[PDB]
């Protein structure tokens, strides 16, 4: 009922363990013994539920008593309770009870996974919420510890417009997943019931909640017309010029296509940006064989929002990685470190198509061909006399920071196929990575480097003996310590992705979380972590 100083130290090690680490029987028995002492440690609760055999009515009953007796757990912690491991309705309702404590700002950072977590919810309880079916026709065809994940997510989506947009598109892609349809019909039936319950709830609401449904419909209808247009252009017989001419021709004909002049609808990619249509003229296809288009949406306040519309490709792997980069950037900023990262938006509108936020930048490879070096590029577009190596100091500070940020982020995520065409640079200093088809240690070539640095990247900083290079190193190990601090949050979100049909996750689902886990080097203390990071940087610039 009360432990001594020796057992308290052992309990503290188990509590500190990664959420994904498997407890030993000895470890499990120690947590169950002093379960009534641990009630004052909110961080211990996750490790406590991990001991229980819910198939045993007595262990299940005993455990739930303690759940209501425990110190209410943090929001990052409750994400573990919504994984495949838990089927107990009272545990799953506990996680939703603690999810309600989060801000909508925080909720959007976890939403992609919260949608995936519905796969582990009670499908009948979702079905009973309702008062062959085309998923993308539900919203475009209207008819005249108490809450679960479905009820909760919908309740919040009605109060928040930004949340509704992502809840909609995330659930529509899930319904659109043909693998899930062929291999898990009960799951597909559930996602349709989520969309059906979403549509139903919006219709019962006030003047604005009712307009939210109309706006989602208008967005679905727009995307649908853009897809049809994409199919026509991709079928067009002729060269890139012939295809661009047909692309510009069809967008221009508003009466026939209805994509250049439309009433203010939110941009699915970033709903805070309202659009009036697509500029026909500036629309061109990227040289790429996948035939993606560059589209300049006319925004609410005269601005131009360039997007990459991809058709005939699955953007869910890039969608996941860019939402994790956005999360890692938000947590770094929270700890007072802004490394000038480009967490550009990516939203799949189907398994077949989706949007990407276009950021005006030049690939490092082109930067090297058109100017000679990163320093030669920065000398032309951002000159300064007093500045380091003739470059504006702000542009150099921005370059050192972003290089440091992406080296750590791309290292933790195991981002492969890292050529200088996949590495983009900005005239303000901003470095960033694109095209995430190879993650979690994958690569098109054997024996890939864990630290993704280049000879020219360092040369752009002004060489290895520079003050900038020291700051690059300093910002690398500092971003590493901060991202290690939020590992319980990062690993729980990746945990909820094991069945999300992401190609590099789908390869070894049972393992994939340990791949990120290992990268953090949780076995090392912050001091060893600092030295390890320096070793990775050292090894990259040498070899």
Ligand X SMILES: CC(C)C(=O)CN1c2nc(N3CCOC[C@H]3C)cc(=O)n2CC[C@H]1C(F)(F)F
User: Which parts of this chain interact with ligand X (CB under 6 A)?
Assistant: 286, 288, 290, 292, 308, 318, 344, 356-359, 361, 363, 424, 434-435
200/349 with CB nearer ligand X: 349
CB neighbourhood size of 210 (10 A): 13
CB of 365 to ligand X, least distance (A): 9
Q: Confirm if 361 and 425 have CB atoms less than 8 A apart.
A: yes
Measured in degrees and rounded to the nearest 5, phi and psi for residue 293 equal: -110, 150
CB of 358 to ligand X, least distance (A): 5
Neighbouring residues of 2: CB distance < 8 A, sequence distance ≥ 6: 37
79/308 with CB nearer ligand X: 308
Secondary structure (DSSP) of 57-121: HHHHHHHHHHHHHSPPPPHHHHTTTTSTT---HHHHHHHHHHHTTS-HHHHHHHHHHHHHGGGGS
Q: What is the DSSP letter of 140?
A: T
User: How far apart (Å, rounded) are the C-alpha atoms in residues 253 and 249?
Assistant: 7
CB of 253 to ligand X, least distance (A): 25
38/322 with CB nearer ligand X: 322
User: How far apart (Å, rounded) are the C-alpha atoms in residues 117 and 205?
Assistant: 26
CB of 290 to ligand X, least distance (A): 5
CB of 409 to ligand X, least distance (A): 15
129/363 with CB nearer ligand X: 363
Q: Where are the beta strands (DSSP E) in 312-394?
A: 346-348, 353-357, 362-363
Q: Confirm if 420 and 365 have CB atoms less than 8 A apart.
A: yes
189/417 with CB nearer ligand X: 417
CB neighbourhood size of 120 (10 A): 17
CB of 288 to ligand X, least distance (A): 3
74/435 with CB nearer ligand X: 435
How far is CA 33 from each of CA 11, 16, 24, 72, 478, rounded to the nearest angstrom?
11, 18, 14, 20, 39
357/468 with CB nearer ligand X: 357
Residue with nearest beta carbon to ligand X? 286
CB of 236 to ligand X, least distance (A): 18
Neighbouring residues of 337: CB distance < 8 A, sequence distance ≥ 6: 475, 478, 479, 482
């Amino acid at each position: 009922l009360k432990p001594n100083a020796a057992t308290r130290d052992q309990l503290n090690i188990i509590v500190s363990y990664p959420p994904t680490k498997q407890l030993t029987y000895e470890e499990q028995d120690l947590v169950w013994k002093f379960r009534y002492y641990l009630t004052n440690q909110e961080k211990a609760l996750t490790k406590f539920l991990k001991c229980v055999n819910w198939d045993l009515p007595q262990e299940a009953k005993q455990a739930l008593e303690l759940l209501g007796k425990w110190k209410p757990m943090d929001v990052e912690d409750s994400l573990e309770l919504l994984s495949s491991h838990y089927t107990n309705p009272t545990v799953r309702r506990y996680a939703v009870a603690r999810l309600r404590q989060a801000d909508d700002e925080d909720l959007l950072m976890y939403l992609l996974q919260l949608v995936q977590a519905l796969k582990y919810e009670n499908f009948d309880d979702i079905k009973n919420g309702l008062e062959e079916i085309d998923s993308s026709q539900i919203i475009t065809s209207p008819l005249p510890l108490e809450q679960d994940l479905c009820t909760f997510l919908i309740s919040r989506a009605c109060k928040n417009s930004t949340l509704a947009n992502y809840l909609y598109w995330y659930v529509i892609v899930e319904c659109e997943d043909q693998d899930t349809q062929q291999r898990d019909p009960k799951t597909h039936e559930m996602y349709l019931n989520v969309m059906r319950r979403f549509s139903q709830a919006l219709l019962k609401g006030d003047k604005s909640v009712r307009v939210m449904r109309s706006l989602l419909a208008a967005q679905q209808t727009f995307v649908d017309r853009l897809v049809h247009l994409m199919k026509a252009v991709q079928r067009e017989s002729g060269n890139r010029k012939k295809k661009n001419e047909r692309l510009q021709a069809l967008l221009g004909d508003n009466e026939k296509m209805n994509l250049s002049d439309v009433e203010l609808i939110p941009l699915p990619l970033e709903p805070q940006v309202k659009i009036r249509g697509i500029i026909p003229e500036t629309a061109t296809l990227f040289k790429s064989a996948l035939m993606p288009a560059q589209l300049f949406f006319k925004t609410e306040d005269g601005g131009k929002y360039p997007v990459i519309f991809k058709h005939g490709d699955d953007l869910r792997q890039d969608q996941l990685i860019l939402q994790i980069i956005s999360l890692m950037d938000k947590l770094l900023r929270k700890e007072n470190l802004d490394l000038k990262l480009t967490p550009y938006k990516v939203l799949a509108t189907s398994t077949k198509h989706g949007f990407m936020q276009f950021i005006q930048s030049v690939p490092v490879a082109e930067v090297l061909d058109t100017e000679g070096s990163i320093q030669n590029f920065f000398r032309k577009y951002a000159p300064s006399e007093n500045g380091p190596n003739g470059i504006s100091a702000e542009v150099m500070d921005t370059y050192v920071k972003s290089c440091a940020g992406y080296c750590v982020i791309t290292y933790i995520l195991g981002v492969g196929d890292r050529h200088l065409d996949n590495l983009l640079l900005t005239k303000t200093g901003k470095l960033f990575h694109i095209d995430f088809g190879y993650i979690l240690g994958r690569d098109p070539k054997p024996l890939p480097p864990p630290m993704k640095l280049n000879k020219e990247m360092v040369e752009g900083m002004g060489g290895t003996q520079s003050e900038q290079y020291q700051e690059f190193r300093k910002q690398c190990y500092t971003a590493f310590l901060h991202l290690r601090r939020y590992s319980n949050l990062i690993l729980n979100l990746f945990s909820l992705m094991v069945d999300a049909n992401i190609p590099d996750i789908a390869l070894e689902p049972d393992k994939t979380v340990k791949k990120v886990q290992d990268k953090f080097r949780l076995d090392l203390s912050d001091e060893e972590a600092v030295h390890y990071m320096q070793s990775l940087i050292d090894e990259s610039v040498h070899a």
